[PDB]
Design a protein around this nucleic acid. Structure first.
Ligand code: ANP
Ligand code: ANP
Ligand code: MG
Ligand code: MG
Lengths: 90, 44, 341, 13, 340
DNA sequence: GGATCCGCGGCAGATCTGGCCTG
DNA sequence: GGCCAGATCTGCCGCGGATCC
């Protein structure tokens, strides 16, 4: 009953291959940068909001670029508005 | 620490090691005296 | 630190075999278009520095490859550096094997003085800010990383603001994460740097010198950003941050780019360079090599005498000009050959 | 020579 | 044309009452921070020159500045006065208030400063601006043509950037202005070069020349037509007189990449002297020449050549740290000028 | 004395050279 | 070989100073 959010399938397979943990896995459309016009609508945030039921913990496995940090901040703000304790990797 | 000066000078001349690399090697050899005695006795 | 030998082949208009400067104060004498600047530039580039000139214009007319070779010994031990300048690009061979240029960043190196510093002192705001950034960047890489991250975040937020709307607080927090760190680092460096400059300049002239840095966001980036929303909406650009600071040099409490003559500005530039040399020497433990070009051109007798007195107490230095200082070893340059009587 | 200098210096440490 | 007398009050750190230069070559000698540059700048301003902020030329803790000059040209003497302060400049000619455009007709003076090197060792924009202002100093149509071309280009770029529309008249206007600007530039540069070459040959031993690069040498319309795809793609006009380049050559090589300090200084001085000679041959009588810090970065031969060339001028004033040999000299100490 | 215009310092966005890591 | 760091170049906007009615 653990959920993680990832940019793309590549990091999904990279994280699952090492196999530290097993849980529900989610993939986004991509990063969040306004230079080439990708807003929240162009991503799959709507789909993520359907299945918050039964979730007790969510971890945001996101890249180290500035776009990744902005996406993580936006997701943390939104989930805190809904209300779920969140964590991020070191 | 004045003794290590001669070791650093000797290690600096050999090719492939920079001036800072020699100090690092000498420091790594200071507290690993097990292999250090063997290293001196390796060729002699 | 001490230089022992310098050899070259097909560099600018130079034509020589070897040059062995003595330990201590030295000098060079030559007429117009002889090669003093070329020799100093070659030494600076050989010891791992950065030359403002383009790479493709550092070779002779007709040839296609250049060679540089220096032999320097330090408190640790002797080693040899070698550069192969050519069409492909620079390559470095420390003691005989390929070495990345970033490795030489840990070596003592050398500092070069040229009228470019004088131009930078009397320049616009952006040139002064760039000079401060480049000066601070030589003491840490974290500063460069923070600058790159801040620039990327600022570009992202400006692009978002220029057209349309979206989540905005995230980018605000992202930019404020770096602005405060940059401001704190700048404040600490200036606090550590000012007194050395003051005491160095006190030995070259009679007036007072100082520094000043005014900040648009002193209390915090977030508070200043939330207090100028209307101006941002009207203009369409960010108006607050470390990328809009102002640095001013003061002579007797007045700006130096409006109330200064040539001699005072040149003295200020030399004082800044000497203070940087002293700080770097304290940082690395062994002071670097000092190279001065056109030491006493636009100065009167008293200032020249004061300049010569200060450079006599340094470990090793090399001065160049059209006249020979009294009481120092002198070498002559004629059409590219250096002969020492 | 050069190697012997290293050999004799190693005994000191 | 002779500058008979010059007075001032509350101008920078000057604290003199009168200064009477003699005919022919003269000299000024002083140490650092004494007021040679201030005196030369005041003399330049008094005759209707260009310069420092207008509010920064007043003495510390004061509000009013006064400059007065008396010149006796060939036809007849006349006086000038300047008032500086918070309100602004008040130029009056011989008692009657008048604008600066009237003084534009008078000969004036030429000032040589260390600021002229950047026209040689600077980027493309600085060289283009220097050429533009040098041409504008001789003709009045050039400024109007430049302003009209700038406005037309701004309108065309603004229209092109925001989507698309009909671009027929803007191209016609741009071509109609560029075809005249380029022709005027060519006509001026065809005559300017030989004088500069001769002057530099007199001053030094190498050879100097000029090179102008034109993107649209046959027609603005055809150049615009032959680049429409990339013009629409990038969104900016890529041809026209506003993208030409000017290069100074020493022995057939660019000066901003190979020349040294002495060669660049000699080239700048030669350019200024050529401009002075052209102005003298155009207006009718040579203007007064002012040279500041004449002989620092030059060797013995170059200094001797410069002095020999300057010896033949109707009037000149030189300032520097060392007195030239064989000429009258005046010293400056803490802002006051005293003469033997 | 009010008002239109002309010129220049200051800043953001696009290009381009030379060094680097991964393989 | 391929991606990024950092300096140089070009055009647009707001501000100061001269001119007019
Ligand atoms: N790549 C090059 N190949 C050959 N000659 C060159 C090259 N670059 C510059 N020169 C020449 O070298 C001379 C400039 O040398 P430089 O080292 O600048 O002289 P300098 O002694 O500093 N002179 P100065 O500072 O003017 O008193 C000039 O004659 C140039 O034409
Ligand atoms: N507005 C001012 N009010 C009062 N004093 C001033 C003002 N501007 C400059 N000064 C003083 O005048 C000095 C500059 O004088 P300046 O005329 O430039 O000297 P100079 O003889 O040309 N010196 P140098 O070129 O260095 O050999 C400054 O250092 C101040 O002491
Ligand atoms: Mg030189
Ligand atoms: Mg001066």
């Amino acid at each position: 009953s653990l959920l993680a959010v990832v940019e793309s399938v590549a990091d999904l397979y990279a994280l699952e291959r090492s196999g530290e943990f097993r849980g529900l896995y989610h993939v986004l459309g991509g990063a969040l940068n306004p230079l080439e016009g990708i807003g929240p609508k162009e991503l799959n945030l709507e789909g993520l909001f359907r299945r918050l039921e039964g979730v007790e913990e969510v971890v945001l496995a996101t890249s180290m670029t500035v776009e990744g940090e902005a996406t993580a901040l936006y997701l943390a703000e939104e989930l805190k508005k809904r209300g779920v304790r969140v964590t991020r990797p070191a | 620490p004045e003794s290590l000066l001669k070791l650093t000078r000797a290690l600096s001349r050999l090719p492939g090691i920079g001036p800072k690399t020699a100090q690092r090697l000498a420091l790594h050899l200071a507290f690993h005296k097990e292999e250090a005695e063997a290293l001196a006795e390796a060729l002699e | 630190m001490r230089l022992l030998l310098f050899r070259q082949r097909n560099f600018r208009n130079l034509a020589l075999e070897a040059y062995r400067p003595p330990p201590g104060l030295s000098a060079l004498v030559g007429a117009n278009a002889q090669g003093k600047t070329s020799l100093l530039l070659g030494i600076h580039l050989a010891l791992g520095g950065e030359v403002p000139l383009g790479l493709a214009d550092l070779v002779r007319f007709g040839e296609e490859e250049a060679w540089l070779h220096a032999e320097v010994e330090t408190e640790l031990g002797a080693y040899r550096l070698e550069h192969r300048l050519g069409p492909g690009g620079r390559e470095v061979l420390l003691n005989g094997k390929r070495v990345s240029l970033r490795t030489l960043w840990e070596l003592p190196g050398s500092v070069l003085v040229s009228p470019l510093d004088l131009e930078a002192v009397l320049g616009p705001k952006e040139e002064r800010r760039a000079y401060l950034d480049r000066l601070i960047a030589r003491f840490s890489r974290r500063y460069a990383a923070l600058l790159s991250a801040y620039e990327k975040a600022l570009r992202q937020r400006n692009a978002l603001l220029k057209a349309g709307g979206e989540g905005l607080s995230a980018w605000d927090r992202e930019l404020a994460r770096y602005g405060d760190e940059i401001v704190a680092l700048r404040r600490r460096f200036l606090r550590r740097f000012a007194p050395i400059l003051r005491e160095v300049h006190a030995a070259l002239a009679a007036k007072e010198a100082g520094l000043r840095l005014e900040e648009t966001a002193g209390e915090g980036v977030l508070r200043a950003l939330e207090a100028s929303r209307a101006e941002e909406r009207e203009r369409g650009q960010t108006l607050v941050g470390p990328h809009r600071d102002d640095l001013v040099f003061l002579l007797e409490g007045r700006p130096a780019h409006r109330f200064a003559s040539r001699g005072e500005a040149k003295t200020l530039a030399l004082a800044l360079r000497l203070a940087e040399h002293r700080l770097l020497g304290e940082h690395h433990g062994e002071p670097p090599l000092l190279l001065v070009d056109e030491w006493g051109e636009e100065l009167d007798e008293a200032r020249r005498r004061a300049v010569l007195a200060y450079a006599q107490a340094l470990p090793q230095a090399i001065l160049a000009g059209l006249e020979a200082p009294p009481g120092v070893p002198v070498c002559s340059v004629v059409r590219g050959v250096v002969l020492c009587p | 020579e050069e190697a012997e200098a290293l050999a004799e210096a190693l005994e000191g440490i």
